[PDB]
Write a protein that binds this DNA or RNA. Structure first.
Length: 334
RNA sequence: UUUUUUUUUUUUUUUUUUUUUUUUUUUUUUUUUU
């Protein structure tokens, strides 16, 4: 049970588990959250996990959430939990801290984005500074970047470039806006346009070799995107803005590995032949196509704002080319 | 290396014909070739 499976397979496994047909199950963390399917034995492979930035010992809250799904009322007299030890003793202080201790409620750092700033500048009145207090040094630095690349003027009035970025919510407002206004995407076909846009959707956490040959084109598109991203990255560092892990290690990861998978999906090819060459499981491929529906909608909106009807019809064709029957399969619970 | 599915609004037709407008006049015998 993990996130790389198709929804139908995952719900099939859940239903079979609920009927007492599965004895041994290897599960990820998502199984514990919700998913009211208790069991009798819970075994921890390790008490540490890698969450984005490095390894970290399990918090007491997660341990309580996972271990609590071990005793079913009526059929069991006690709930057993097994912690493994692999030819090496484990420290007792860490064990006591993980197992015994008051859980703490989570908190968020309230990340500030450029889309939020651009949306807040269009609101009549609403002095922004007096609301941020109830982050101030960061807000001034971000305003200087927006004025440098001509998103706003000297009086902080939103221009045409800023209006487009206000409609892009997913991940990267400034880079996408620069790409659209640079007459990019005007030479490619609908199949090739959606193939290049997957870099903003696929995070490239794999380490497998990318396809050595893609096409004579779609390689110039790779270079153009990387140059534009590199130029935007220099502006960010000029104003001394702290960067997130995702934005810092963007070109370091292999985020272009799914172009071939998306390219053949839109061109028309049986999904069995696609999986013979894709570097990700079936569950991951369907997620990428699902996330590419929102990107096409945003680019269609930007075309109306700037008045380019050629780009509007290209994006309409792309949406119809990435729809298949398997992504609309009915749930087995219904 | 866990974790991440986003998609705005409208209902069943104004009433009475063809006309559709400018610069000033005359006088007495057939037919053909000349």
């Amino acid at each position: 049970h993990h996130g790389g499976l198709l929804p139908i397979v995952k719900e099939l496994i859940e239903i079979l588990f609920s009927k007492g047909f599965i004895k041994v199950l290897f599960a990820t963390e998502t199984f514990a959250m919700g998913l009211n399917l208790p069991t009798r034995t819970v075994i921890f492979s390790s008490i540490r996990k890698h969450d984005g930035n490095g390894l970290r010992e399990l918090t007491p809250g997660e341990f309580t959430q996972m271990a609590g799904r071990a005793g079913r009322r009526g059929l069991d007299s006690t709930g057993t939990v097994i912690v493994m030890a692999y030819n090496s003793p484990l420290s007792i202080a860490t064990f006591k801290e993980v197992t015994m201790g008051v859980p703490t409620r989570l908190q968020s750092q309230f990340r500030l984005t450029y889309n939020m700033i651009l949306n807040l500048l269009r609101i009549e009145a609403l002095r922004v500074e007096e609301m941020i207090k109830y982050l101030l040094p960061d807000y001034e630095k971000r305003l200087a970047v927006l004025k440098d690349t001509e998103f706003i003027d000297q009086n902080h009035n939103v221009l045409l470039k800023g209006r487009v970025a206000c409609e892009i919510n997913s991940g990267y407002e400034l880079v996408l806006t620069e790409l659209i206004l640079d007459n990019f995407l005007g030479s490619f076909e609908p199949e090739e346009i959606v193939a290049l846009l997957s870099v903003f959707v696929y995070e490239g956490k794999t380490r497998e070799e990318e396809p050595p040959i893609v096409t004579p084109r779609l390689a110039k598109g790779k270079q153009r995107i990387e140059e534009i991203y590199k130029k935007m990255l220099c502006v960010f560092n000029t104003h001394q803005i702290p960067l997130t892990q995702d934005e810092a290690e963007f070109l370091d990861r292999k985020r272009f590995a799914m172009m071939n998978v998306v390219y053949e999906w839109a061109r028309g090819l049986s999904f069995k032949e696609i999986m013979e060459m894709s570097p990700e499981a079936e569950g991951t491929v369907v997620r990428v196509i699902t996330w590419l529906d929102e990107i096409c909608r945003e680019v269609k909106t930007a075309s109306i704002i700037i008045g380019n009807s050629t780009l509007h019809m290209k994006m309409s064709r792309a949406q119809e080319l990435i729809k298949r029957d398997i992504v609309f399969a009915a749930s087995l619970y219904l």
